[PDB]
Amino acid sequence: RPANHRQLTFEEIAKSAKITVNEVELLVMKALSVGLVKGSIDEVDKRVHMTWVQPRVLDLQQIKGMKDRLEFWCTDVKSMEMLVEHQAHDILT
Amino acid sequence: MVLESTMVCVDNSEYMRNGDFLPTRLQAQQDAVNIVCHSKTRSNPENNVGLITLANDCEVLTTLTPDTGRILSKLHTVQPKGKITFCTGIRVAHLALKHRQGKNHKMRIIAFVGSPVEDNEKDLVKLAKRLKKEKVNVDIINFGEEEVNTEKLTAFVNTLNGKDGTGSHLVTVPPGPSLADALISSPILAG
Amino acid sequence: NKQFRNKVLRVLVKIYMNLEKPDFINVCQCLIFLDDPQAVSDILEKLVKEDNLLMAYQICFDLYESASQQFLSSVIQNLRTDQTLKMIKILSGEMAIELHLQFLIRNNNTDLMILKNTKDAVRNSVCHTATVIANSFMHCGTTSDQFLRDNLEWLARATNWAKFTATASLGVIHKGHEKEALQLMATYLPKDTSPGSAYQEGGGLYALGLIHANHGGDIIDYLLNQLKNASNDIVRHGGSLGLGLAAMGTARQDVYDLLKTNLYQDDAVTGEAAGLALGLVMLGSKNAQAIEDMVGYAQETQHEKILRGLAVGIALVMYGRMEEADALIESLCRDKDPILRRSGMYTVAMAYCGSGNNKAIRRLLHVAVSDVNDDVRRAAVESLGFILFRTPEQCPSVVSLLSESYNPHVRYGAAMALGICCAGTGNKEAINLLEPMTNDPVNYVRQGALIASALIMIQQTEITCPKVNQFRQLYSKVINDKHDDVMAKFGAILAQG
Amino acid sequence: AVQKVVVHPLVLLSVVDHFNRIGKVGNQKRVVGVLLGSWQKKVLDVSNSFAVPFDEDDKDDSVWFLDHDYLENMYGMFKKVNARERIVGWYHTGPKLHKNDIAINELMKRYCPNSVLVIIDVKPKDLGLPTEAYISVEEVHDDGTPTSKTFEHVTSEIGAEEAEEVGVEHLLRDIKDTTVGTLSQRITNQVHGLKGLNSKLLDIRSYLEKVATGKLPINHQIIYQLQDVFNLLPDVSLQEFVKAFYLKTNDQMVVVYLASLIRSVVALHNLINNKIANRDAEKKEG
Amino acid sequence: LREELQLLQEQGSYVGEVVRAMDKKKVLVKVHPEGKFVVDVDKNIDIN
Amino acid sequence: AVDTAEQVYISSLALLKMLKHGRAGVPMEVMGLMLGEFVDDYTVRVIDVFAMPQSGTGVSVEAVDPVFQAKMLDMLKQTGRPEMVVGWYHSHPGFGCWLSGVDINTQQSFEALSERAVAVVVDPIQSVKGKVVIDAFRLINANMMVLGHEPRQTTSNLGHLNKPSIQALIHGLNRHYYSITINYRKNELEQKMLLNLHKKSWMEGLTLQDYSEHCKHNESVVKEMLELAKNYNKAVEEEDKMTPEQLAIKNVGKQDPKRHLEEHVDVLMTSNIVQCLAAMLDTVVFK
């Protein structure tokens, strides 16, 4: 998911892993012991709140969209910061 | 006296570990280093002589110096196992000759080839015309077993210099049992 | 701007020619304003066609006096293509030199007592140039000099550049007198007897260059041959200065060439020599390859004097250019070289001389604010006297606080600015602001206060301003007082000159 | 091992002035010398250095040599005059190291247990703090290849102590100092921001260019994991990031409230006292 | 400030007491923590 | 014989070795040697500076090691430029860097061998940043007692060198000695990069890192110092509200003001760091 929006629900894990609702505790918390996620579990609605993530692979056409996520950060900082000192360029001299 | 810097090249190729030269080529070329370092000592005091390993990776363990003591120490336990490499063996000593502080010393290299080489004739003629542009005079003495009456090396020395240039001389081991001192007896009297 | 100015001016002298009463002061105004080479040849050809003699005498001398040398070269070029010898006499200005010589020898009013009180001081520092340059001023053009007779042991104290200036004053006091100036100096001639004083023989040709400035004669080539002879670089110091100063404004060609092969002799003190010489010969020419070679030689050279000589050199080549020079002024000011920035200061000064435009004061005053080098900042605030000299009254008001600055360099150059700008006026405000300047603890700011205070009082007697005799007695006082600094007291005897 | 190194302006100039030494005679290759380090702790410091004549053939691009007698007796010279100084490695002007630079460190590993090589830059252009630092280490690989040496990058910082501060701090004579609070932080917002834009831009340009040309490979010893680390955080709301928004708004509350407080205090004092001394000076003199 | 902060270290400064003055223009003064000195004018304030 | 105004062209590498060799010996005075070339009388240049080893005899004419000079000049011969020696220098970290009796005792030897041999002294102590400090000395010829002792001509650099007049005990050496002028020649490219090298302090380490480290902390524990700044708000401004009432009692200014001015305006300049760098989050978080 683009997310985050890192908070999941019990229905998502129990339907995907096709395991009972009592064993999803052992499921997600063992992954906390593996080290792939540090997240916490909200047991009122039985939701699961993930934190960070464990990077594994990725793919082609991802270096392109990576340049899109980058160049957008490029024109963001360029525009706004060039607007900042555009105001105060006069008073400097 | 004559001004020049002589760079001696020992042959570390795996074919140089045999005892055909009595008692062993290790001590035979050691005496060869003994006679070239003592002759250049009796020639000019300003001559500085280092050593270079031609086979496998080329590394000079003894920086160019007139004292041969550290060179004599590297002659022992040299571990001369490897495949002979020619084209780089001359140029590695050429770079050591470009590090000389004084520029009045002529560039001179002496090397020993005791092993059959895979170097193509195009590579040695490119080094020949390169040494023609760089003026370097190299005097090679062929030891060990190789092609009978070495040609590509003889043509290498021939095409290396000309007019005169007095000069590059090649001494090939004769096809017969002899001591290493008898092989180096000719070059020490006349190049 | 000069765009529509001369276009309105050119028709007004034509309506004066169509007017019944001819008046030469209006064509005199356009001669010094419109300043075009063909117009003076047109109006004077109409004077020769009119057979005018008596009343053309005015406008003809206004042409010699108030117009450029190339303006004289242009009018003589189209004219010569009684009155034929008259135009030679009026354009050469020899009669003006002879009457000036007779005016100076007959009417000379001097006082030797002050020169003797400065003589017997005999201070070994900085006094070498002091007395000789001061009495060379007051006595200019007399040719009667008794100085080496009245002061002797003081001149025997001379060493190094002292004998340069000593024989250089020989030319300052002999200024004018174009004829006998060469042969009358035979005793003081630039020997070149080789117990080497050689700055001596360099200053001798310097003296011959001070007299031969503006117009001249074969003596220019006489110094040129001696530049190609004798020794080096000691001859080039005052000799090439003589070669360039005599050709000043004449747009001489060969001097630019033989000074390039002379520039390549690779020495230091001769740097200012060829720099000022090449800058004087190219004055007003706004050439291309001259500045290109001067800016091309400044790299491989290790000397800062060749940088300063070429600084004023490329500054002097451009005079009255206004916005035409700003293309180069932008490059000289934007550069990080302080000497080249100071070069652009003298360049923008001579280009904006006479104009009060605020385009110059933009960058000129900007580098006078934000720059970290006090010397070029000093030359920046000195240009106020060059460009604003037409309106001296406002300078004491705008530079009022600018003489209160912490560094003495700004207080100095500003004191020189107020001195040279208001010099032609009797304004008491400049003298009021210069009163605390001579009270400043720093030495050379008092010195510049002494020189500038003598510049405001020029020809002005006690009835003009009350501070005349007060400063006159203050000059002899500080120079006769050993406790005061030698630097600050140098401008005292200088002020007396 | 070696974490960070402190490169003083003295050692950098000691390479660059030798770039004038052999640069006036030229021509190609680079300026190589022996680096004199000072190790007080895990953080490395550099004080002095010395340069040795060096030439490298291209033929034979792997051939390199240095003068050991120069390294020996001059170390005996510099250790004599200063007992605290010793060689921590070597250096070169790059700009980018050729593959042959490894064996130089392997030869001088007999002098020092760990020799850190410092790439430098004689002509400042881009992108930031000059030079570079590489430490000699054997990382093997996750692919279990026979152990090879790929030098790990050591972060380099510029510093000084006392006298080295005196020289350069007077030598600036260029820009205002600092000035604290006004121009300082905002120019850093331009430099660190914009140089961060073109950094990753050209670096992501190399990311795609290496995939387009240069394979093998470079994809993926680290490509797959590093690029996923880029995909770790997109990172936008909902939800808690919306809470951080107006919480940050609640953070600017106090400071701008204090701002209005200083406005009232500064305006009160200055305006009242100035008008007092103003009206008094006018009514008394006039 | 820096100039007087430069002036005052290479020397220091103290306060004396004149016990006599000299015909040579010198003055008899003590360095009070130590033995006495005898110094001379000091051209601003005269002997009288 | 002929004397003219002198100028010392120095290289930044020379000044670096100067203060570096002087800082490593503090407090103890060290002994170096000056290296360069004599172009003429009125101009001189020092293109290199090397340090002599410290010995037991202390600072003395015998402290110069001849075999060190022979091997150094040999090491300079294999170095790119083997220029000839010129003069000597010794640091004085512990005092006002004035020439002692041993300094002139080695000066007649350096003037014997070398014609000029300008003596230079340098100290770190005087100024930490904004002064040239260092020093300059040249021994006047005692054989000149016949002629006058007061050259030079072109007094520009001379009269400007004398100022401050350098105390008393230093200008007490102005008899029998005289200083010499020093200017910094460019070499602008290296001077500009080394300028930015120390600017890494107040600007940023990489010109990126340190104020991206200001993006690391970034209000973080930086509000703790804002809490101490707002404690300086309460502290300083609770006695600042007592000031204007007292001004009405004493009628009025006691000159004064207490200052007790500016201050937290700079804290609001850190609030400009707050608004700017946090406004970067909209650029950081989104794409």
Ligand SMILES: [Zn+2]
């Ligand atoms: Zn001492």
